């Protein structure tokens, strides 16, 4: 009665909703720098998840309460119809918090909305959060120090992080973030075939192998980027194409 | 040249405002217990500060928003012809936070409104904050654990606290808080003569010497209360009667 190769049923009529929160600028008083190139990430993410069958929903620079209000809705509608749920955060962040346009929001209160008790129709289904968030200071490469704790949240949750403690995230102003770029390239090629954690492992390598060129910037030599992911999943996750 | 006996000029035509924020009950979502007896404290403080020449203003169970607007109004009106400013907080509190009816406010946010730069009519003038606040759990004596950090606020600020860390606050459902009772008694007898910090030291002794019967509570025997005060005053403070 035990299957070492057991998979999440990706049978349902719909793949599910992919939520993306894109944050480009911030409230004057938060004194946080712009994140140029985040729109490129947004669009890249939009195309790749659509191709995987997701109902992509994008929101730009929502205020804390707008964002909360919106995600709370998506948690209180039925997903009984779908395979899984995806939520992406593209902003600045610190410790346990991520930044909405004007205020900090605790990641745990964002994922908590989708736990087994608050969201019955996702019980047993993969809940995947992807976080490109760090601390702020033609194509320019900006370098930001890791800030967001790479924590997990709940059963069947999968937290994917652009960078781990002691490392630095990178964002090109035109092509977007290294993490996002690489993640989206793996999705395009292997998204509909590879087990999803194995794929993220591919992203780990692709990003970690990225160097710079000594002359692009004097202040960015040896600031390597190593992403990571915290898995709470209980089965194998594939995104084979739906009929 | 230098006056070791130097005192705050208290010869302004008005003494000043006494701001009392009274909170007896709270928003259900805060799960904070009622504070029976806080009205007795309010009424006591009101008369003792009136007799000292203050213009007392009591506000009951205000929400964070109305409270902030209201204190910001007092902070922006002229105190040019006043001796000082008094603000009292009666409510639950925790760490650096006090509670308004529906949300918590930082004490530093409240005190910050009256600092040298932000309030000009009060510069060089004694700014006195009195805080009866702790952690929530016929006459009855209730015991609450010390929870509010006892910190200073800035130059010419006098921060007065009902209880210090590791001790317990007490409030009688009819008579009111030990701290407030003892403070008001000292104010009544010595308020218009004694130097105010020395009068607080008296209050330290009176409260620290208080005991419960141990005949009405088995669940409070040995829980002593010792107040404290953080002074950043720069001169002697007296409330001698005005002409």
């Amino acid at each position: 009665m035990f299957d070492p190769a057991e998979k999440y049923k990706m049978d349902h009529r719909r793949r599910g909703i992919a939520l993306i929160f894109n944050h480009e600028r911030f409230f004057w008083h938060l004194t946080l720098p712009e994140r140029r190139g985040t729109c490129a990430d947004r669009d890249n993410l939009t195309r790749r998840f659509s191709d995987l069958g997701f109902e992509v929903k994008c929101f730009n620079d929502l205020k804390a309460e707008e964002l909360l209000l919106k995600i709370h809705e998506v948690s209180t509608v039925s997903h009984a119809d779908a395979d899984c749920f995806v939520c992406v955060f593209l902003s600045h962040g610190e410790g346990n918090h991520i930044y909405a346009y004007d205020a900090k929001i605790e990641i745990q209160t964002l994922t908590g909305l989708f736990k087994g008790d608050k969201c019955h129709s996702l019980v047993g289904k993969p809940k995947i959060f992807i976080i490109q968030a760090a601390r702020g200071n033609t194509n320019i490469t900006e370098v930001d120090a890791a800030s967001v704790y790479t924590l997990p949240a709940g059963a069947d949750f999968l937290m994917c992080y652009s960078v781990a403690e002691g490392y630095y995230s990178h964002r090109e102003t035109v092509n977007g973030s290294w993490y996002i770029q690489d993640l989206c390239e793996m999705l395009g090629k292997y998204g509909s075939s590879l087990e999803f954690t194995e794929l993220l492992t591919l992203v780990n390598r692709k990003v970690s192998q990225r160097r710079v060129d000594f002359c692009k910037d004097p202040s960015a030599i040896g600031k390597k980027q190593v992403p990571c992911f915290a898995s709470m999943l209980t089965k194998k996750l594939h995104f084979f194409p739906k009929s | 040249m230098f006056d070791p006996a130097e005192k705050y000029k208290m010869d302004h035509r008005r003494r000043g405002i006494a701001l009392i924020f009274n909170h007896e009950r709270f928003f259900w979502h805060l799960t904070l217990p009622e504070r029976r007896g806080t009205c007795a404290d309010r009424d006591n403080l009101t008369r003792r500060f009136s007799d000292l020449g203050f213009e007392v203003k009591c506000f009951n169970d205000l929400k964070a928003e109305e409270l902030l607007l209201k204190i910001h109004e007092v902070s922006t009106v002229s105190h040019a012809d006043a001796d000082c400013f008094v603000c009292v907080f009666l409510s639950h509190g925790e760490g650096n936070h006090i509670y308004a009816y529906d949300a918590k406010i930082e004490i530093q946010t409240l005190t910050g409104l009256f600092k040298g730069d932000k309030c000009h009519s009060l510069v060089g003038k004694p700014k006195i904050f009195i805080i009866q606040a702790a952690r929530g759990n016929t006459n009855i004596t209730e015991v609450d654990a010390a929870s509010v950090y006892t910190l200073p606020a800035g130059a010419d600020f006098l921060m007065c606290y009902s209880v210090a860390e590791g001790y317990y606050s007490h409030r009688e459902t009819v008579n009111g808080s030990w701290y407030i009772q003892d403070l008001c008694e000292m104010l009544g007898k010595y308020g218009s003569s004694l130097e105010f910090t020395e009068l607080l030291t008296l209050v330290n002794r009176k409260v620290s010497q208080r005991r419960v019967d141990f005949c009405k509570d088995p669940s409070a025997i040995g829980k002593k209360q010792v107040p404290c005060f953080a002074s950043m005053l720069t001169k002697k403070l007296h409330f001698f009667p005005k002409s």
Binding site: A64, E65, L68, A103, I105, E106, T109 | W28, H29, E65
Partner: peptide, 12 residues
Amino acid sequence: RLHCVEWTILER
């Protein structure tokens, strides 16, 4: 003016 630094989602 006024600013919320933390929002929660109420149960009722």
